[PDB]
Amino acid sequence: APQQINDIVHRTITPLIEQQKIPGMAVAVIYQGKPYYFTWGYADIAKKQPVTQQTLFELGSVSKTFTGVLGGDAIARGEIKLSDPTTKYWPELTAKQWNGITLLHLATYTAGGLPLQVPDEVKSSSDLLRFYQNWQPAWAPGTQRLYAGSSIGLFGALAVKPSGLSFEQAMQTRVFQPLKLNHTWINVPPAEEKNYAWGYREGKAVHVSPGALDAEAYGVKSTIEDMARWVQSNLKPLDINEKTLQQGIQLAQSRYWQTGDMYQGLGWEMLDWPVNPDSIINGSDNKIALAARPVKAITPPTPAVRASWVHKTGATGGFGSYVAFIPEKELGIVMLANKNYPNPARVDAAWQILNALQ
């Protein structure tokens, strides 16, 4: 790595790992379009297996960036429109609160207070229809953003229906394969098991458990190299030959709603560059990130913006991840860890690193 990258990474990440007691960690910095990699510590503490550039991490909610891009690709294919009512794709959803709720609203957390999590007791397709039928809204559609896996999760599941493919098959064939993400999985295969890091939650090694809408909201696992490649793909979509996927990447970075200084995309979230650092750092704390806030209905949505800080935090029980990039500066970062540590610490570290490399 260029010495200016070594120096800031090392000065930033070393105290981060120490303060947060992270067992293992991988970082990629994208600098002038090329990736540079760093690893620390252990994928498997018990087996003393180090973190490598082939180690698989659970992305948690950074998976929602994949769902938003897959969704954009479906829009670009003419399969769906975000203005379509939810009921076009799920006719059984007959209860009257579903009148007015569109694919846009599911995708962008604005349906009117769908919850953060689908309950553990919802397992089957039949359970899921009951869940959404018996749900009653806190607010009217397209008025408040409440961050919610049960919202974007459903968008993902509905969005694939006109393709005639399962969510996983569509993601494989339409996003992972064309982008040459050959070590990114919704279900880790046997050839890869030995590279799947353990997550650590209060000292116990954990992997994420199956749940309803898991693939759609928090299901992806990936390596630092594939994630750097994902950031490259999202920084410079024009390099992508598949026209619908290029366009879908753009649509996911389109600004659909504004809330304070932040914009909601499809999965991705955005702020204007230059950022107010204190704002992205304190905005990432769950007190704010998980709270309901008004959306400036933006009509029509504002197109993607080169001068943007684009990012997404993610966690599972034993992992914490973060991705951010700045298309204007050809700069990016991925941070993957096998402990879930507080969002503001992630964003503070990422800001410390990327501001120094412009």
From Swiss-Prot:
Q: What induces it?
A: Can be induced by beta-lactams. Expression is not up-regulated by the non-beta-lactam inhibitor, benzo(b)thiophene-2-boronic acid (BZBTH2B).
Effect on the protein of changing K312A: Lowers activity more than 1000-fold
Q: Which GO terms describe its molecular function?
A: beta-lactamase activity
Q: How is its activity regulated?
A: Inhibited by the beta-lactamase-blocking agents avibactam, enmetazobactam, relebactam, nacubactam, vaborbactam, taniborbactam, zidebactam, and beta-lactam-analog boronic acids, via a covalent binding to Ser-61. Inhibited by non-beta-lactam, benzo(b)thiophene-2-boronic acid (BZBTH2B) and various cyclic boronates. Not inhibited by clavulanic acid. Inhibited by O-aryloxycarbonyl hydroxamates, via cross-linking of the active site Ser-61 to Lys-312. Weakly inhibited by citric acid.
Domain of life of the native organism: Bacteria
Mention any additional remark. Answer: The class C beta-lactamase family has a specific amino-acid numbering system known as SANC, for structural alignment-based numbering of class C beta-lactamases, or else the simpler name structural position. A multiple sequence alignment was used to derive a consensus sequence and then the consensus was numbered taking into account insertions and deletions. This allows use of identical numbers, e.g. for active site residues, despite differences in protein length.
Give the protein's function: Class C beta-lactamase which confers resistance to penicillins and cephalosporins. Has benzylpenicillin- and cephaloridine-hydrolyzing activity. Has weak cefuroxime, cefotaxime, cefoxitin and oxacillin-hydrolyzing activities.
Q: Describe, as the record does, how this protein assembles with itself and its partners.
A: Monomer.
Any idea what this protein is called?
Beta-lactamase
Tell me which species this is from: Escherichia coli (strain K12)
Encoding gene, per UniProt annotation: ampC
